Structures are given as structure tokens and as C-alpha cells.
Amino acid sequence: MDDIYKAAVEQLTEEQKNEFKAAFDIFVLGAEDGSISTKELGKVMRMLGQNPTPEELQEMIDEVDEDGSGTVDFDEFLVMMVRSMKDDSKSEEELSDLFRMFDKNADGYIDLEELKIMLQATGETITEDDIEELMKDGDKNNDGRIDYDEFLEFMKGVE
Amino acid sequence: QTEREKKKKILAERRKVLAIDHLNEDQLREKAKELWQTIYNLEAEKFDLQEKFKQQKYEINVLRNRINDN
Amino acid sequence: AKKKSKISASRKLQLKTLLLQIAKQELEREAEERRGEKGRALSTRAQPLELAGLGFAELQDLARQLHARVDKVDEERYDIEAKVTKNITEIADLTQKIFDLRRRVRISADAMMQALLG
Numbered sequence: 489m490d491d492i493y494k495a496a497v498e499q500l501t502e503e504q505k506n507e508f509k510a511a512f513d514i515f516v517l518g519a520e521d522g523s524i525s526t527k528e529l530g531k532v533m534r535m536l537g538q539n540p541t542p543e544e545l546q547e548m549i550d551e552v553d554e555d556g557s558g559t560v561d562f563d564e565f566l567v568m569m570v571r572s573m574k575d576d577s578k579s580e581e582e583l584s585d586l587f588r589m590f591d592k593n594a595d596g597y598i599d600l601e602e603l604k605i606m607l608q609a610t611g612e613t614i615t616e617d618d619i620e621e622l623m624k625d626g627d628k629n630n631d632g633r634i635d636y637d638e639f640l641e642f643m644k645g646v647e
Numbered sequence: 648q649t650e651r652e653k654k655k656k657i658l659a660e661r662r663k664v665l666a667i668d669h670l671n672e673d674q675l676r677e678k679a680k681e682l683w684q685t686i687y688n689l690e691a692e693k694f695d696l697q698e699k700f701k702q703q704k705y706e707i708n709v710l711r712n713r714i715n716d717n
Numbered sequence: 718a719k720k721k722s723k724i725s726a727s728r729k730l731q732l733k734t735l736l737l738q739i740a741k742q743e744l745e746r747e748a749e750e751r752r753g754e755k756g757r758a759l760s761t762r763a764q765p766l767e768l769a770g771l772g773f774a775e776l777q778d779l780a781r782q783l784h785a786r787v788d789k790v791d792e793e794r795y796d797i798e799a800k801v802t803k804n805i806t807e808i809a810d811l812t813q814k815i816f817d818l819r820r821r822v823r824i825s826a827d828a829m830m831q832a833l834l835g
């Protein structure tokens with residue numbers, strides 16, 4: 489259960505969380521569930537010049553529904569806001585060059601070894617946790633190594 | 648040497664003679680400098696081409712795995 | 718334990734972001750060395766001249782050598798360029814294989830906030 493957005497929310501300042509709430513609280517005004525139903529999302533969408541069908545709308549809810557409620561709550565809304573939040577621009581080309589800087593032995597696989605040395609090269613006091621962790625996410629095959637493709641999938645959306 | 652080979656040899660010598668022989672001791676020194684530079688620049692393109700060749704070798708190799716593991 | 722759960726998401730990204738920055742940092746540490754590597758190699762493959770005390774015959778000898786070396790070095794350069802060209806083509810092919818092997822309605826961040834809030 490590790491996502492690039494979950495960290496997004498967590499780093500939201502109290503100043504940010506506070507304003508998103510007033511936005512949310514105004515967003516669900518009129519709702520009996522006190523949450524975002526298609527009724528609410530279509531309203532705001534229409535304020536934004538768009539008239540989605542009830543389907544496409546509920547579909548956007550699902551995009552973030554975690555409880556099968558078929559609606560959006562404040563925490564789910566917070567996620568939604570950071571997803572559309574980043575104007576994040578890195579190219580598979582940039583990452584491909586970085587890949588090669590991880591593969592100290594040039595085998596075409598960032599392995600458990602090089603990962604630690606690498607993760608170590610960065611001023612952060614690394615623990616066996618960070619190591620155990622980082623390799624887990626990247627290791628889509630967990631074949632002890634991290635190949636090109638999943639390295640891309642790995643750094644996808646990273647500053 | 649085959650008549651074809653002497654001809655390669657001669658015409659190569661003739662290129663030297665046509666470019667160098669009429670120069671005086673001063674135009675000479677400057678010619679040497681010109682040729683030197685040309686070599687240097689050619690030698691520099693070679694080194695960039697050599698470095699890129701190595702990188703392509705690794706890129707071709709990574710593409711090997713990527714195609715293996717699929 | 719999911720044993721994927723060990724640390725936060727704020728942490729995962731905390732490092733990933735750092736990983737990349739020493740890699741980019743290492744990427745140009747390399748490019749930097751590649752430079753001195755070139756100068757050093759040029760200094761050897763194309764030693765500067767010393768025409769100071771050469772007579773006419775010796776000087777003329779040199780120019781002839783250097784004239785011969787321009788042909789030579791250029792062929793060498795061609796041969797390496799060919800191997801590199803080929804490689805651009807072999808790369809285009811492999812990539813076209815991996816590529817071959819392995820409307821929307823979305824909300825706007827700044828647009829929404831401006832709508833809801835005053």
C-alpha cells in the first residue's frame with residue numbers, strides 16, 4: 489500500500505489542510521451524506537465549464553473511493569487534490585541516464601548491492617528499514633534486482 | 648608493385664608534393680601548424696565517437712535484458 | 718505485517734528524491750572527468766608541435782608526415798563513426814521491439830479552489 493500521493497497528503501501544511509477543508513465543507517453543502525456524490529461533483533464541474541454524464545462523474549469518484557461508499561470524504565478529497573495538484577513535468581530519457589549511475593557494475597540491473605551503496609551515497613542516515621523498503625517497491629519481480637522498466641515505474645513522479 | 652599500386656603510391660606522393668613543395672620555409676611552418684590542428688580536431692571527434700560507442704554498448708545491452716525478460 | 722509497510726510513504730519518497738540527486742550529481746561528476754580524460758588523450762594522440770630548431774629538410778619532412786597523418790587519422794575516425802552509426806540503427810530496432818513486446822473528464826487543481834472558495 490505505497491503511493492506517491494500518500495506522501496503528498498502527509499506533507500500538506502496545516503495551512504493547506506485548513507483551506508482544503510473549507511473548500512470541502514463548501515463542496516458538500518447540500519449533501520445529506522455530508523460527502524461528495526455525483527450531484528456535488530457535477531455542480532462544481534459545471535462551475536468549471538464542464539457537464540460530465542452521471543457515469544463519468546461517479547467514475548471520478550471511484551478513481552478515489554476507498555470504501556465502496558460511491559462518494560468522496562475529506563480524506564479521499566485530499567488525495568484527489570494532490571493528484572490534480574502537481575504540475576510535475578522527468579523524461580524516461582533523464583531517468584535512463586540516472587539508471588546507468590546506479591548500475592555500478594554495468595550489468596543493466598540495479599541490484600540489492602548497488603542500491604544500498606547508492607542509497608548510502610546520499611547524506612541521509614539510512615537504516616535497514618529504508619533499504620528493506622526501497623527495494624520492495626521497486627522490486628516488481630523481486631528477482632533480487634531492479635530492471636530498467638521497473639526503475640522507471642519506481643521513480644515515476646519523483647522530484 | 649602492380650601498376651595500379653604504383654599509381655596509388657605516386658598520386659599520393661603527388662598530393663604531398665602539390666601541397667608542400669612550393670612553400671618556403673615560413674609558409675612551411677604555418678602549413679605544419681594547419682595540418683597539426685586538423686589532426687587535433689579529427690582526433691577529438693574520434694574520442695567523442697569512442698566515448699559514445701561505449702555508452703551505446705551499454706544501452707544495447709540494457710535493451711537486451713529488457714527484451715529477454717519479456 | 719504486510720512487510721511492505723515498514724516505513725512511511727513520506728519516507729519512501731524522502732529518499733527516492735535524494736537517490737536521484739546524487740545520481741544526477743554523479744552523472745555530471747562523470748561528464749566532468751570525461752573532459753580531462755579527453756584533453757589528456759588529445760595531448761597524447763596529437764602532441765603539440767616543436768618547430769623551433771628544425772631546418773628546411775626536417776621541416777618539410779614533418780609537413781609530409783603530418784599530411785600523411787591527416788589521411789590516417791581521418792580513416793580511423795570514419796571507421797569508429799560507422800560502428801556508431803550502425804549502433805543508432807540497432808538501437809532503433811531493439812527499442813522498436815521492446816515497444817512492440819512490452820475522451821477524459823478530470824478535475825483541475827487551481828480551477829477548483831477558485832470555484833469553491835472566495
Ligand SMILES: [Ca+2]
Pocket residue numbers: 552553554555556557558559560561564
Ligand atoms: Ca468514499
Ligand SMILES: [Ca+2]
Pocket residue numbers: 590591592593594595596597598599602
Ligand atoms: Ca548492477
Ligand SMILES: [Ca+2]
Pocket residue numbers: 626627628629630631632633634635638
Ligand atoms: Ca527486480
